[PDB]
């Protein structure tokens, strides 16, 4: 029972893509999903929203491994 987890990020908050895993340039998660997930230990790149876009916590399309992160499992 597998979920995603849909967050959308407010202004000024920060994200975090994974660049070994990321399928496309846009792949990112939030801060509570990335650091209950694999990617936490894996080459990451911090961004900022400036209000929206979401997390892809859950999407197993965006990610080469480790699409869910242990609470989204
Ligand atoms: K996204
Ligand atoms: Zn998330
Ligand atoms: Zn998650
Ligand atoms: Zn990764």
């Given at each position: 029972g597998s979920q995603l987890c849909g967050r959308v990020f407010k202004s000024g908050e920060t994200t975090y893509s994974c660049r070994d895993c990321?399928?496309?340039?846009?792949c990112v998660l939030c801060m509570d999903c990335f650091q209950d997930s694999?990617?936490?230990?894996?080459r990451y790149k911090m961004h900022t929203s400036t209000g929206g876009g979401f997390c892809?916590?859950?999407?197993?399309?965006?990610?080469?491994?480790?699409?869910?992160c242990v609470n989204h499992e």
């Open positions: 990321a399928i496309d340039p846009t694999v990617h936490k230990n894996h892809d916590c859950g999407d197993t399309e965006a990610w080469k491994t480790g699409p869910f």
